[PDB]
């Protein structure tokens, strides 16, 4: 293509996309190196597919997983949102590190590094304990509480390496580091899922209707990701440009979906916490009621999963945009909404805009998370071909927001001049 | 009657979002399907490659 030819003629961006591809190879070789002492025979045989009460897998299921990178950068995601939730007036070491400047922010990032390595350690312990406790009665040889620690520190050292090459590819490769790594952790499962969809085989009619439903939902998700309520802003402190155009006027781009994907991530966490605590008590009469009502594929599980998505995307939208901090930030340095008194009234204005625009991205995200059950029922795919959810929302997000960052080097190359 | 005004102004403020229009929308869908196809094929190839090299390294 005439633009990918541009991308692989100019020197530095060709070197950095080749560096990105080499680091994805260094990533994906580590999924074949396993945890050092686990009985990997029981790991591969354990296939308790779906529609089971106990196993109501979400994102595809980490069943034939458990390599050294298998903890993922999900500890870093949850530790980073914990410290983001804690900067908001709680524990004011972080509040003073936030308000002081950016070399305090380095100590804040270092706190986040150590809190990730802690949660990676204890969640590797919890994962291996659960994943030997029911998926296979025996999975670690020489089993016992003294030997979970070696494989848990192997997993934690692994995702420490994964965050390491994340920041190496964001320094030297193309775009975001760990977003390209998560994109490589999602899109590297589609080869097996094409094998399973083909190996199943409304012979072709069903698959053609499926592929155009996938392209229809991917254009819906681009249409909702790439949209802005451009609030017009106006800095009072310079002379309005003496004869401006008004076409590129300073604005303040509120996203339609300010919360990102994160509210559905901790919606599945609060979904599967009560079955995994009621699984300890033993099979009672209420435990089977619990796993019937928190199976998210049945129309009480879908409804409470939807209501948790709506609630956490309202909450996390207000923690993400934060209308009080942005109105105080606007009147702290100049600008104001044209017509709106820049103290309290500009925060109530951007609060009301933020409610009425969070509703749309809210029910968008609810529908994009309850889509994959509505394809597995109504299209008879293998019930691990779960298209939709976070794995859709962040494949298209990482793909676009590194395409843009990639081709914003060419405009540096292509200055013209009037002479020619 | 707070809901019957609220959803009305939700529909009103959907008329003020700067939505992406059809030209760069089709450009974006071409881009994202190109990257998912290339990375699917690339990951399939390197998984086959390191599979068939590890299975002789054992």
């Amino acid at each position: 293509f005439r633009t990918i030819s541009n991308f692989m003629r100019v020197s530095d961006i060709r070197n950095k996309i080749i560096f990105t591809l080499l680091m994805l190879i260094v990533f994906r070789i580590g999924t074949f190196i396993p945890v050092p002492s686990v009985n990997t025979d029981v790991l591969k045989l354990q296939d308790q597919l779906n529609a089971f009460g106990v196993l109501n897998i979400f994102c595809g299921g980490a069943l034939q997983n458990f390599s050294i990178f298998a903890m993922g950068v999900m500890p870093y995601i949850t530790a980073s949102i914990i410290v983001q939730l804690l900067q908001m007036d709680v524990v004011p070491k972080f509040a003073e590190w936030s308000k002081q400047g950016e070399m305090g922010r380095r100590k804040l990032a270092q706190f986040t590094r150590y809190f990730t390595i802690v949660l990676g350690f204890i969640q590797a312990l919890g994962m291996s304990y659960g994943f030997n406790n029911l998926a296979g009665g025996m999975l670690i040889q020489n089993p016992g509480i003294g030997t979970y620690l070696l494989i848990a520190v192997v997993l934690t050292a692994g995702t420490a390496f994964l965050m390491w090459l994340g920041e190496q590819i964001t320094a030297k490769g193309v775009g975001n580091g760990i977003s390209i790594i998560i994109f490589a952790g999602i899109v590297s499962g589609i080869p097996t899922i094409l094998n399973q969809i083909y190996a199943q085989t409304l012979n072709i009619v069903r698959l053609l209707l499926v592929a155009l439903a996938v392209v229809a939902v991917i254009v819906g998700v681009i249409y909702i990701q790439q949209a802005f309520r451009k609030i017009p802003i106006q800095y009072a402190k310079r002379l309005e440009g003496r004869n401006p155009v008004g076409g590129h006027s300073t604005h303040l781009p509120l996203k339609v979906n300010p919360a990102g994907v994160i509210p559905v991530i901790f919606a599945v966490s609060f979904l599967i916490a009560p079955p995994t605590i009621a699984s300890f008590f033993g099979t009672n009469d209420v435990t089977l009621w619990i796993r019937r009502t928190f199976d998210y594929t049945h129309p009480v599980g879908m409804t409470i999963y939807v209501v948790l998505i709506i609630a956490f995307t309202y909450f996390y939208a207000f923690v993400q945009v934060n209308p009080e901090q942005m109105a105080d930030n606007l009147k702290k340095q100049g600008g104001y909404i044209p017509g709106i008194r820049p103290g309290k009234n500009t925060q109530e204005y951007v609060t009301r805009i933020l409610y009425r625009l969070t509703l749309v991205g809210s029910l968008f995200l609810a529908f994009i998370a309850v889509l994959p059950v509505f394809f597995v029922n109504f299209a008879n795919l293998p019930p691990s071909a779960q298209i939709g959810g976070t794995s859709l929302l962040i494949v298209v997000g990482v793909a676009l927001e590194t395409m843009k960052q990639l081709e914003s080097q060419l405009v540096k190359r292509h200055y013209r001049g009037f002479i020619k | 009657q707070r809901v019957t005004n609220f959803f009305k102004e939700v529909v009103r403020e959907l008329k003020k979002v700067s939505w992406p229009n059809r030209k760069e929308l089709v450009n974006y869908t071409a881009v994202v399907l190109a990257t998912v196809a290339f990375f699917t094929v690339f990951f399939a190839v390197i998984d086959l490659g390191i599979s068939q090299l590890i299975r002789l390294v054992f």
Epitope: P34, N39, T40, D41, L43, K44, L45, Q141 | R55, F58
Partner: nanobody
Framework: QVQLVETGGGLVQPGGSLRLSCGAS????????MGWYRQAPGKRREVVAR???????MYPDSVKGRFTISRDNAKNTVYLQMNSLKPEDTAVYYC???????????WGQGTQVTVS
């Protein structure tokens, strides 16, 4: 790669004993993991017996101790001796092998042990 047969399973009352002998065709056999799993309806399919190169016998929490696994070369056979049977174990049984680490652990056919 190796052809694999499983004998000794059949019809038995709950409270008896059985002897599953799994014999192979390919004769090198010094491998990673030999085992035994079910895949009854209700799938779950659980490794019932597991034996490594050290013959470090591993058993799950439901059938711990009552069974034993025995390896021999000079006739490539593993032995799942079964004692004090129970009506829940009405299942097909399977004897699986695996050469090195992961290297796709291959199955066999099974013997449908009926117990009720």
């Amino acid at each position: 790669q190796v052809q694999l047969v499983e004998t000794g399973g059949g019809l038995v009352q709950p409270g008896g004993s059985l002897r599953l002998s799994c014999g192979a065709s390919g004769s090198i056999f010094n491998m990673y993991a030999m085992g035994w799993y079910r895949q009854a309806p209700g799938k779950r399919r659980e490794v019932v017996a597991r034996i490594a190169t050290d013959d470090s016998t591993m058993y799950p929490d439901s059938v711990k101790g009552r069974f034993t696994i025995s390896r021999d070369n000079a006739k490539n056979t593993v032995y799942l001796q079964m004692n004090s049977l129970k009506p829940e174990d009405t299942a097909v049984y399977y004897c699986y092998y695996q050469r090195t680490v992961m290297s796709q652990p291959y199955w066999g056919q099974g013997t449908q042990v009926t117990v009720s």
